[PDB]
């Protein structure tokens, strides 16, 4: 696709042409609030007599479902100060930089981190540095330490004797998690090891079981041929703990402060949803939803899946 085609010949380095070595980078951590880790370059790259310096924003992740947000000021967003700013990769965040041998080269982020969520838009604009900001959400599980980079380089912008700075983002993901409570309805090996239950193609009504507790993450890799699903906007509670308002049907309605990731199932690559039960929620709740498939190619028999979600069933 044009959103993520990689140029295999592209080459660069962390320092670029600044001649600065890493021991002289101005290194600092991302500003982290809740589960959003933000690198904001809006005021870090303006030209100064001392320029160009290297501003390295370090994003260190060893927890699940962290959203990474990177803001790079736009050319002409302020007169003169960013006339020659460049960002790399141009197709961030779908394409990132990783170190191969000793240089930075382009890599598909979704191939690097299975289950990673790239939404098409940010603030109702394209998720691309051309609009000033990119975002992505790391998955509930990462098996291998992973390091990749973004460049927001204002070092070629000149204003009087002053030069802008070269901004680097280093995202350093340490391994975290093991397996998502839930089911994968079945490169392929990545799919088979990511969820606790693998539902291989069946021609009947078959049950997936997602057992969760306070603080747990669950998720589902939905079938390829999905037509319709009530997971998780139209849940049906069973077992009679409390009285049920039939309009309080989403997991949000039923579990205060629960979060569903990729509700719109509009993230690229991965036909997944993740759910997070908050640590505050201590009540017991058994829920049900369903997945219906398209009969595009008939097997003479229709496929459907029942998804059972039990919360705090202890």
């Amino acid at each position, epitope marked *: 696709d044009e959103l993520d085609k990689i140029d295999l010949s592209y080459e660069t*380095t962390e320092s670029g042409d600044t001649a600065v*070595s890493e*021991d002289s980078y101005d290194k600092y951590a991302s500003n982290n609030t809740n589960k959003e880790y933000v690198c904001d370059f809006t005021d870090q790259l303006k030209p100064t007599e001392s320029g160009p310096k290297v501003k390295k924003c370090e994003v260190k992740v060893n927890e699940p479902l962290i959203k990474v947000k990177i803001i790079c000021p736009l050319k002409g967003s302020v007169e003169k100060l960013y006339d020659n700013i460049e960002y790399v990769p141009k197709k961030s965040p779908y394409v990132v930089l990783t*170190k191969e041998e*000793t240089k930075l080269k382009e890599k598909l982020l979704s191939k690097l981190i299975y289950g990673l969520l790239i939404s098409p838009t940010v603030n109702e604009k394209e998720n691309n540095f051309k609009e000033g900001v990119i975002e992505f959400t790391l998955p509930p599980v990462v098996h291998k*330490a992973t390091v990749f980079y973004f460049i927001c380089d204002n070092s070629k912008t000149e204003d009087d004797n002053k030069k802008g700075n070269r901004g680097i983002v280093e995202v350093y993901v340490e391994p975290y998690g093991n397996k998502i409570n839930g089911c994968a309805f079945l490169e392929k090996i990545k799919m088979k090891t990511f969820f606790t239950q693998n539902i291989y193609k069946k021609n009947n009504i078959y049950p997936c079981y997602m057992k969760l507790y306070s603080g747990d993450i669950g998720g589902i890799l939905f079938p390829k041929n999905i037509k319709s699903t009530t997971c998780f906007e139209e849940m049906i509670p069973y077992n009679k703990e409390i009285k049920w308002n039939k309009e309080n049907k989403s997991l949000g309605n039923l579990v205060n402060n629960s979060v569903v990731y990729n509700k719109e199932m509009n993230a690229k690559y991965f036909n997944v949803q993740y759910v997070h039960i908050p640590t505050s929620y201590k009540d017991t709740l058994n829920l049900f939803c369903s997945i219906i498939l398209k009969e595009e190619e008939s097997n003479l028999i229709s496929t459907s899946y029942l998804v059972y979600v039990s919360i705090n069933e202890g």
Partner: single-chain antibody
Amino acid sequence: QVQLVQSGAEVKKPGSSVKVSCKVSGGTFNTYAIIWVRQAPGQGLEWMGAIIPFQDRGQYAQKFQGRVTITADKSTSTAYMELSSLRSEDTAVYYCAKESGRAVADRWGQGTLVTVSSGGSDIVMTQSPASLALSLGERATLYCRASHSISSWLAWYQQKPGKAPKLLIYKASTLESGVPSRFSGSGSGTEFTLTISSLQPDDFATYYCQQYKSYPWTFGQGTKLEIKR
């Protein structure tokens, strides 16, 4: 600043193994490549392999495949190189080095002497002249040719006897910090030059060019620049 300190000299019997350590202090360890280079006495520099510590796996020159293991201990910022089935020809000074965001190996250990006592499509670097005899204050011009196009991914190193290589120029023409301006580099593609505008006593040494376009990194056999008799 950044220091690489290696373990001390070793004497081994033929057929044995040796493990050399390289402790990095004052620089970031986990995300920058550590390389290992050896130099047989009186001979040139030879790339053996590299590791980016967070990856938990090294890369090796085919010449050493199956005899060399490169590892890194992140909690101590120490890299290791283990060479097995030692033979006489493995007698050499082994160097560790690291890159610092500019692709080139710009920080070097002091070297470890190891004494043994009882491929196709690689880029070939050709230096000339093999020897230069010049007087103080004269200009020196050194040449380096690559068998394949390497754009400007070429470095120049100065080595004094017994000492580790010292980076002078990287990206063909960029001076390393602290290097006097009488050193200059030129060229791109396959032909490169190092010029010393006016020779001073400190400038007499062996100079090596090195392509760092692609592994295995390869060195020219050096130009020995000595005082005119």
